[PDB]
Amino acid sequence: SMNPPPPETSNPNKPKRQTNQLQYLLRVVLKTLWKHQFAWPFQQPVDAVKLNLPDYYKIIKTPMDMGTIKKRLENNYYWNAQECIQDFNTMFTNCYIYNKPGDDIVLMAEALEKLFLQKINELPTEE
Numbered sequence: 311s312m313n314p315p316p317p318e319t320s321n322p323n324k325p326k327r328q329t330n331q332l333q334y335l336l337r338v339v340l341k342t343l344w345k346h347q348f349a350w351p352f353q354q355p356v357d358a359v360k361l362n363l364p365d366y367y368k369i370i371k372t373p374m375d376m377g378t379i380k381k382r383l384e385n386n387y388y389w390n391a392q393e394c395i396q397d398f399n400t401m402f403t404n405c406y407i408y409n410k411p412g413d414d415i416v417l418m419a420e421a422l423e424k425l426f427l428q429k430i431n432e433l434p435t436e437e
């Protein structure tokens with residue numbers, strides 16, 4: 311009945327690189343989903359204490375959110391765009407694992423997921 315610590319977002323021992331796929335992911339992909347009307351429940355880790363969700367982290371063992379993804383992006387944590395995408399894909403799937411199909415938070419996730427997929431359907435070819 312406590313929050314876990316957040317996922318790792320910095321590690322200086324990890325190699326850094328700037329590519330156009332990571333920049334796209336931040337500048338286009340994360341911007342877009344961040345400012346979307348449904349983004350608000352996903353901009354930080356599920357606060358299972360504040361939200362009164364003791365069982366959240368009894369069911370979700372691989373948590374992820376768009377704030378952790380920002381901190382990862384901005385902190386040059388990712389080497390591969392697919393590491394980012396998987397994180398976005400964990401975010402959604404966690405929502406679908408925890409919540410009841412068809413409620414509101416799942417509907418919210420499904421439209422953000424459709425926005426995400428579209429943008430990723432034409433991520434930049436590596437320059």
Ligand SMILES: C[C@H]1C(=O)N(C)C=Cc2cc(OCCOc3ccc4c(c3)C=CN(C)C(=O)[C@@H]4C)ccc21
Nearest residue numbers: 350351352356357361363366404405408409414415
């Ligand atoms: C009709 C309308 C309404 O009546 N009003 C007033 C306006 C908006 C409004 C909002 C609503 O927001 C629902 C959000 O519910 C949840 C459920 C579960 C979780 C979250 C949020 C938070 C984060 N995450 C990622 C989770 O997975 C946890 C477990 C629903 C209805 C309305």
